[PDB]
């Protein structure tokens with residue numbers, strides 16, 4: 001496992017998130033389910049408790065965007081970069097973005113939103129790319145690996 005430069009971590013247990021907008025590809029409940037389920041993957045093996053917000057600035061702002069979208073890492077159309085997220089911190093830090101030129105699916109016939117979001121939320125909680133592993137930098141009965149659990153626990157702690 002690997003962490004971000006300067007070992008950044010959330011300095012609180014209660015974290016908030018907001019889904020700012022939605023992909024055309026799925027219904028909103030399917031997006032909510034994938035994201036909500038993506039947060040539980042990490043919530044289950046840490047003392048972190050997530051809460052949802054509909055107004056205002058949440059810690060983890062979740063949005064779908066294409067090309068240039070307000071940060072130093074513009075998306076690249078279909079394929080290549082599917083999504084990116086930021087390390088723990090204020091502002092853009094902690095936020096997760098999804099490239100809406102990909103075809104986001106409930107299943108595997110396109111790009112699975114749940115799997116990518118789980119990997120993206122890993123970035124939101126301070127995990128960088130692994131060497132084996134959900135945090136491995138390539139998209140390919142799902143379970144969180146020991147290498148993944150090592151990083152989040154040796155940072156926040158166990159439940």
Ligand SMILES: COc1ccc(S(=O)(=O)NCC(=O)NO)cc1
Pocket residue numbers: 080081082083084085115116117119120123134136137138139140
């Ligand atoms: C399923 O987990 C992922 C998520 C995204 C990607 S990727 O978009 O191809 N690489 C960018 C990346 O590392 N985002 O966090 C690769 C694997």
Ligand SMILES: [Ca+2]
Pocket residue numbers: 058059060061089090091092093094095
């Ligand atoms: Ca943020």
Ligand SMILES: [Ca+2]
Pocket residue numbers: 075076077078079080081082099101102
């Ligand atoms: Ca892309």
Ligand SMILES: [Ca+2]
Pocket residue numbers: 023024025099100101102103104
């Ligand atoms: Ca799309």
Ligand SMILES: [Zn+2]
Pocket residue numbers: 069071073084097
């Ligand atoms: Zn972005």
Ligand SMILES: [Zn+2]
Pocket residue numbers: 119123129137
């Ligand atoms: Zn990644």
